[PDB]
Nucleic acid binder design. Structure first.
Lengths: 51, 116, 66, 104, 87
RNA sequence: GGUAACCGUAGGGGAACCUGCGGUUGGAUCACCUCC
RNA sequence: GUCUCGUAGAGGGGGGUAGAAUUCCAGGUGUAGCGGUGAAAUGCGUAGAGAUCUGGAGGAAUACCGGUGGCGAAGGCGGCCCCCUGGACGAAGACUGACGCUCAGGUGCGAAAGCGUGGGGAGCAAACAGGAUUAGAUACCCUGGUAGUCCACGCCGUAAACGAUGUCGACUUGGAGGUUGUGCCCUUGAGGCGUGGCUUCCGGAGCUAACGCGUUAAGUCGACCGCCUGGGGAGUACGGCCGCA
């Protein structure tokens, strides 16, 4: 990110890295990416349908 | 000797020894320090408190080269390593631009296997 | 909101820099389809066109180049 | 018989000779009954990232209908020249003729 | 193959050139594909994926020929000599 | 938003089992009054 | 089953080409440590290291889009472009006229690991060397690291190769969703009414020992193939075929 902002300074404006980056990168890339069992690792989204 | 004014700084946020360098935007290095140069060792060296000391060694050695404004380049997964740029800010250099330069790959070399 | 079904595209040109820059993120990545709401076919066309355009230097690979 | 889009890159040092090559290449295409529907000379352009330690380049584009045998000859004549920088070829579905949205 | 090349064979082996249904035109078309296609694997030996379609075409050719044998040997024989088929 | 016990295979070695490559969900142990 | 017009698709071989990333080499700056785990050591260290910048050599895989999405007979297929190539589907008719379904033997295809001849060799990494440590002790941990991993040209033909569900047809209430075609309304624009493929999840009759399946059946039926007959011994022995092993 090229940070350039208005004159006030020392806020450092990186509070939104949570969505301005896939923050898990370099947490999961300096190690053998497993990636196996991937779709059932997406399975949990379906389980929440309720009424 | 030489005047740099608006220099650039480089930090390496490794889980181990943090690297801090001051550069004059032409690749020639003005000064440099580690969390390990002062004799710190072990896990006393990986806490964010530890990264400050190298930042003040760099700052207080580079006074003669005369930094007035500065840039800083940050790469690394180390948590809370911007304490170093807090230290440079508190040292009086007007920090104007910041970039993250973390060497991400486009899935090239194979990463080492993990421990259990 | 979506631009394709309103402005009209049966095929999308990769040299149309407007609709291309509109779907790239702050750092050169591609926006996911779930954020924008585009149809799947058109999203696939965007993903192809923009990666040709990167080859054709109409876009940079990443912001780390000054 | 199929139609193709072609775009290439040239060294800015060779600006004077960009349209001499344009005419030479279209003559080579048309000599084997080649036809052209669109041609654009986009001219000088700043690159999105430095290639061959360069910062500007000259853009050329055209849409051609031609038989496949001449394309490989024309591409090799790109690749053997000093002043070419990059090239691209595309096969298209229909003979488009409307001018390129860049010029706007 | 190409539509231009397909159009000639239907007119040749067909009754009226829109008929395109009599087994003669089918087997002629299949042969037209195979004899040209044999030159694919002269240097694309590795391709194991279009071989399945190739063997499907050759099986279908032989299977319609075995259908002709049970209905009239005369045009079967004339057809195989026209195309140069072994059997 | 880290819960593995198996498979096919190859090098190692033995109350026992380890790792290298790839794959699956079938993802946990029982029903002991007097000698335990 | 064939022809006509189109559509989506990581379906397959060959050749180019790009950017990020990783080592190694060279040239500056610059100080003396760097590297690693819960802690240390081994190992490089000033015949000048790392850190940083630039140039160059070389190898492998394609971040982002990217999903219970797509293609494929299965195994499996993911940068971009070009050449060659298989299959599927839709609209409207036209034509052939039972040309069909299944298939013992047989042929072919068949993840990864493994062999043979020759290349190439960045990273990773069975074996091996060293450091360390507990609670048996070699192993889990950390430095290095050969085969292998990659490419040709051949063998091997086994997997929890699984949807634990052979193939091909016909008939039987529903609801919601994805993906890809296409008719229609006076189209008063991204909207409404209909009709075909392939898929995902709830559920009715029915079936089941139950779990559960439920128009993509494990429901009601028909055609052909393969297999089973208590647990261990045992997918082992001796034969035969195959294989360099």
């Amino acid at each position: 990110i090229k940070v350039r902002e208005n004159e006030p300074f020392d806020v450092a404006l990186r509070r939104f890295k949570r969505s301005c980056e896939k923050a898990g990168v370099l947490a999961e890339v300096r190690r053998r990416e497993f990636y196996e069992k991937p779709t059932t690792e997406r399975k949990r989204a379906k389980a929440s349908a309720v009424k | 000797r030489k005047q740099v004014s608006d220099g650039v700084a480089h930090i390496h946020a490794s889980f181990n020894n943090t690297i801090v360098t001051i550069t004059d935007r032409q690749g020639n290095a003005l000064g440099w320090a580690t969390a390990g140069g002062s004799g710190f060792r072990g896990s006393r060296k990986s806490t964010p408190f530890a990264a400050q000391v190298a930042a003040e060694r760099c700052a207080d050695a580079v006074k003669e080269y005369g930094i007035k404004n500065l840039e800083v380049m940050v790469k690394g997964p180390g948590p809370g390593r911007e304490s170093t740029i807090r230290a440079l800010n508190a040292a009086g250099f007007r920090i104007t631009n910041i970039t993250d330069v973390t060497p991400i790959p486009h899935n090239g070399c194979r990463p080492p296997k993990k421990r259990r | 909101f979506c631009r394709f079904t309103a402005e009209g595209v049966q095929e999308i040109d990769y040299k149309d820099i407007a609709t291309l820059k509109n779907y790239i993120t702050e750092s050169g990545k591609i926006v996911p389809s779930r954020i924008t709401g585009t149809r799947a076919k058109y999203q696939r066309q965007l993903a192809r066109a923009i990666k040709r355009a990167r080859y054709l230097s109409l876009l940079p690979y990443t912001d780390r180049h000054q | 018989m199929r139609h193709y889009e072609i775009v290439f890159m040239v060294h800015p040092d060779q600006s004077e000779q960009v349209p001499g090559m344009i005419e030479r290449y279209t003559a080579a295409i048309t000599g084997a009954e080649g036809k052209i529907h669109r041609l654009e000379d986009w001219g000088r352009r700043q690159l999105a990232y430095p290639i061959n330690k360069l910062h500007k380049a000259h853009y050329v584009l055209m849409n051609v209908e031609a038989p496949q045998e001449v394309i490989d000859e024309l591409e090799t004549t790109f690749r053997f020249n000093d002043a070419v920088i990059r090239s691209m070829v595309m096969r298209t579905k229909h003979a488009v003729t409307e001018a390129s949205p860049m010029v706007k | 193959l190409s539509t231009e090349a397909t159009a000639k064979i239907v007119s040749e082996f067909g009754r009226d050139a829109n008929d395109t249904g009599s087994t003669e035109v089918q087997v002629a078309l299949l042969t037209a594909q195979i004899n040209h296609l044999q030159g694919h694997f002269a240097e694309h030996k590795k391709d194991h994926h279009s071989r399945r379609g190739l063997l499907r075409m050759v099986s279908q050719r032989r299977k319609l020929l075995d259908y002709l044998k049970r209905k009239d040997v005369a045009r079967y024989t004339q057809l195989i000599e026209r195309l140069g088929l072994r059997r």
